Write an enzyme that holds these catalytic residues in place. Structure first.
Site, PDB file in Angstrom:
ATOM      1  N   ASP A  82       9.239   5.550  12.997  1.00 14.93           N
ATOM      2  CA  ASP A  82       8.266   6.147  12.237  1.00 14.93           C
ATOM      3  C   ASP A  82       8.351   7.577  11.507  1.00 14.93           C
ATOM      4  O   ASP A  82       8.227   7.543  10.475  1.00 14.93           O
ATOM      5  CB  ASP A  82       6.756   6.138  12.869  1.00 14.93           C
ATOM      6  CG  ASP A  82       5.997   4.788  13.185  1.00 14.93           C
ATOM      7  OD1 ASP A  82       6.562   3.843  12.577  1.00 14.93           O
ATOM      8  OD2 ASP A  82       5.190   4.581  13.936  1.00 14.93           O
ATOM      9  N   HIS A 124      -2.433  12.113  11.152  1.00 15.31           N
ATOM     10  CA  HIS A 124      -1.906  11.504  12.460  1.00 15.31           C
ATOM     11  C   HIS A 124      -1.067  12.403  13.120  1.00 15.31           C
ATOM     12  O   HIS A 124      -1.207  12.077  14.655  1.00 15.31           O
ATOM     13  CB  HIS A 124      -0.902  10.221  11.960  1.00 15.31           C
ATOM     14  CG  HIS A 124      -1.417   8.942  11.392  1.00 15.31           C
ATOM     15  ND1 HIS A 124      -2.868   8.436  12.273  1.00 15.31           N
ATOM     16  CD2 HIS A 124      -1.224   8.076  10.678  1.00 15.31           C
ATOM     17  CE1 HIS A 124      -3.003   7.418  11.487  1.00 15.31           C
ATOM     18  NE2 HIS A 124      -2.206   7.064  10.727  1.00 15.31           N
ATOM     19  N   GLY A 132       2.964   8.686  12.856  1.00 17.12           N
ATOM     20  CA  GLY A 132       2.522   7.782  11.580  1.00 17.12           C
ATOM     21  C   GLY A 132       3.148   8.174  10.530  1.00 17.12           C
ATOM     22  O   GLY A 132       2.015   8.323   9.296  1.00 17.12           O
ATOM     23  N   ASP A 159      -8.785   6.006   4.453  1.00 21.54           N
ATOM     24  CA  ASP A 159      -7.445   5.582   4.907  1.00 21.54           C
ATOM     25  C   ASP A 159      -7.592   4.145   5.670  1.00 21.54           C
ATOM     26  O   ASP A 159      -8.429   4.288   6.816  1.00 21.54           O
ATOM     27  CB  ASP A 159      -6.593   6.321   5.484  1.00 21.54           C
ATOM     28  CG  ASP A 159      -5.090   5.545   5.638  1.00 21.54           C
ATOM     29  OD1 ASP A 159      -4.074   6.337   5.134  1.00 21.54           O
ATOM     30  OD2 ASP A 159      -4.783   5.001   6.144  1.00 21.54           O
ATOM     31  N   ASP A 248      -3.949   2.340   1.044  1.00 19.49           N
ATOM     32  CA  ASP A 248      -3.510   0.983   1.998  1.00 19.49           C
ATOM     33  C   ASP A 248      -4.725   0.379   2.184  1.00 19.49           C
ATOM     34  O   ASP A 248      -4.534  -0.608   3.082  1.00 19.49           O
ATOM     35  CB  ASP A 248      -2.782   1.598   3.015  1.00 19.49           C
ATOM     36  CG  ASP A 248      -3.528   2.858   3.882  1.00 19.49           C
ATOM     37  OD1 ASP A 248      -4.438   3.026   3.867  1.00 19.49           O
ATOM     38  OD2 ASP A 248      -2.590   3.216   4.955  1.00 19.49           O
TER      39      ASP A 248
HETATM   40  O1  SHH Z   1      -0.924   4.364   7.043  1.00 16.53           O
HETATM   41  C1  SHH Z   1      -0.576   5.376   7.555  1.00 16.53           C
HETATM   42  C2  SHH Z   1       0.744   5.944   8.290  1.00 16.53           C
HETATM   43  C3  SHH Z   1       1.413   4.476   8.473  1.00 16.53           C
HETATM   44  C4  SHH Z   1       1.877   4.472  10.169  1.00 16.53           C
HETATM   45  C5  SHH Z   1       1.360   3.155  10.703  1.00 16.53           C
HETATM   46  C6  SHH Z   1       2.710   2.220  11.252  1.00 16.53           C
HETATM   47  C7  SHH Z   1       2.916   0.945  10.534  1.00 16.53           C
HETATM   48  C8  SHH Z   1       4.464   0.908  10.726  1.00 16.53           C
HETATM   49  O2  SHH Z   1       5.266   1.691  11.081  1.00 16.53           O
HETATM   50  N1  SHH Z   1       4.816  -0.376  10.438  1.00 16.53           N
HETATM   51  C9  SHH Z   1       6.069  -0.765   9.876  1.00 16.53           C
HETATM   52  C10 SHH Z   1       7.553  -0.122  10.215  1.00 16.53           C
HETATM   53  C11 SHH Z   1       8.497  -0.657   9.477  1.00 16.53           C
HETATM   54  C12 SHH Z   1       8.408  -1.817   8.534  1.00 16.53           C
HETATM   55  C13 SHH Z   1       7.140  -2.359   8.238  1.00 16.53           C
HETATM   56  C14 SHH Z   1       6.043  -1.916   9.136  1.00 16.53           C
HETATM   57  N2  SHH Z   1      -1.562   6.408   7.411  1.00 16.53           N
HETATM   58  O3  SHH Z   1      -2.691   5.757   7.838  1.00 16.53           O
HETATM   59 ZN    ZN Z   2      -2.910   4.339   6.568  1.00 16.10          ZN
END
Ligand code: SHH
Ligand code: ZN
Length: 358
Positions: A82, A124, A132, A159, A248
């Site tokens: 991540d 996060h 995150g 979010d 998102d």
């Molecule tokens: O949206 C966010 C941060 C996103 C962190 C959530 C993890 C999702 C994730 O890592 N999924 C993923 C990773 C690689 C490819 C596709 C999905 N903040 O709210």
């Molecule tokens: Zn998000």
């Protein structure tokens, strides 16, 4: 008396270099530049967040490790898949905090009613750990700074994910309140913050969390939002607001969970705005890059209170907005798995919790 907009090419380009969203800030600023809305705002160049400035919240080891790395010990400091270790994130993170700190500083100097930092909103990252796609909780740095002039601060988190890192930091205190509206279902990041999680200690009940399921459109979202915030504002009586307006939740985001249009979120923004409080506006998640730029472009509209041209104007990233080339987004057609039963069962639990604040 006009809004502060945090921009510089150096900043924007630093923000395009974050791996998980290449070219998003470029795009965002660009669609805004294209609608000329930056000419109706005071553009403020963001400062570099000093080692100490970041150390307000992030434990110095971290902020020292993340500097060498940005030039083995990576798995300790929360880094992972991540959160890559791209040499050099230290400046990347130091630009988001700095930006958010600069925005907050304007608000506390009395430079504006409203300050915007679309590039920030990383709700996060923990005090010692990345999480995150977040390397640095810039909201926390924003709130802390806001707390020099203003007494009660309110974080609102719209979010798709739980603002867990902001929740964590201010879970103990009653001098900051967090309202997070997000998806809740196990496996789904960050998998903290069910309604029940309300804050501990001297700040118990000073953390709201609204768990919601897939499908929800504007109509219903504004309801839960207008509801909660009305009771929150009346009770909490805040001196400044910090808004995280993650993209998102919007239709077409590959994270494909909520079904928002920018109009629906904008109705919430209109709501928070009528309070005439100091307001720090932050971005967040956004993975349909065009939909995000559409979305925050829209929102800057409502902040400025200027209705925008429906046809997307030509600029750098014009091609991304095809085929239909417009500002509005069509909701996807799929079930609203939020039974109106559980919603009322969630308002009450919260509503009763507010009878304790404060
Ligand atoms: O949206 C966010 C941060 C996103 C962190 C959530 C993890 C999702 C994730 O890592 N999924 C993923 C990773 C690689 C490819 C596709 C999905 N903040 O709210
Ligand atoms: Zn998000």
């Amino acid at each position: 008396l006009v809004p502060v907009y945090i921009y510089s090419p150096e900043y924007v380009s630093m923000c395009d270099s974050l791996a998980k969203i290449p070219k998003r800030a470029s795009m965002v600023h660009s669609l805004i530049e294209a609608y000329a809305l930056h000419k109706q705002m005071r553009i403020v160049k963001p400062k570099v967040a000093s080692m100490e400035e970041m150390a307000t919240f992030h434990t110095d080891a971290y902020l020292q490790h993340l500097q060498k790395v940005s030039q083995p010990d990576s798995i300790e400091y929360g880094l992972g898949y991540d959160c890559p270790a791209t040499e050099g994130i230290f400046d990347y993170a130091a630009a988001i905090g700095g930006a958010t700190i600069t925005a907050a500083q304007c608000l506390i100097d009395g430079m504006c009613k409203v300050a915007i930092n679309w590039s920030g909103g990383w709700h996060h990252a923990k005090k010692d750990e990345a999480s995150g796609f977040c390397y640095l909780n810039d909201a926390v740095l924003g709130i802390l700074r806001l707390r020099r002039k203003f007494e009660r601060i309110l974080y609102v988190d719209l979010d798709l994910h739980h603002g867990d890192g902001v929740e964590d930091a201010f879970s103990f205190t009653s001098k900051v309140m967090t309202v997070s509206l997000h998806k809740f279902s196990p496996g789904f990041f960050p998998g903290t913050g069910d309604v029940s999680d309300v804050g501990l200690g001297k700040g118990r009940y000073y953390s709201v969390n609204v768990p919601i399921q897939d499908g929800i459109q504007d109509e219903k979202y504004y309801q839960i939002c207008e509801s909660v915030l009305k009771e929150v504002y009346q009770a909490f009586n805040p001196k400044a607001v910090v808004l995280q307006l993650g993209a998102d939740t919007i239709a077409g985001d590959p994270m494909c969970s909520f079904n928002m249009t920018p109009v629906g979120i904008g109705k919430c923004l209109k709501y928070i705005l009528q309070w005439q409080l100091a307001t720090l506006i932050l971005g967040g998640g956004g993975y349909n890059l065009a939909n995000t730029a559409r979305c925050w472009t829209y929102l800057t509209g409502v902040i400025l209170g200027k209705t925008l041209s429906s046809e997307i104007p030509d600029h750098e990233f014009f091609t991304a907005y095809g085929p239909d080339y417009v500002l509005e987004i069509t909701p996807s057609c799929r079930p609203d798995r939020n039974e109106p039963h559980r919603i009322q069962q969630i308002l009450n639990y919260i509503k009763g919790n507010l009878k304790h604040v404060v």
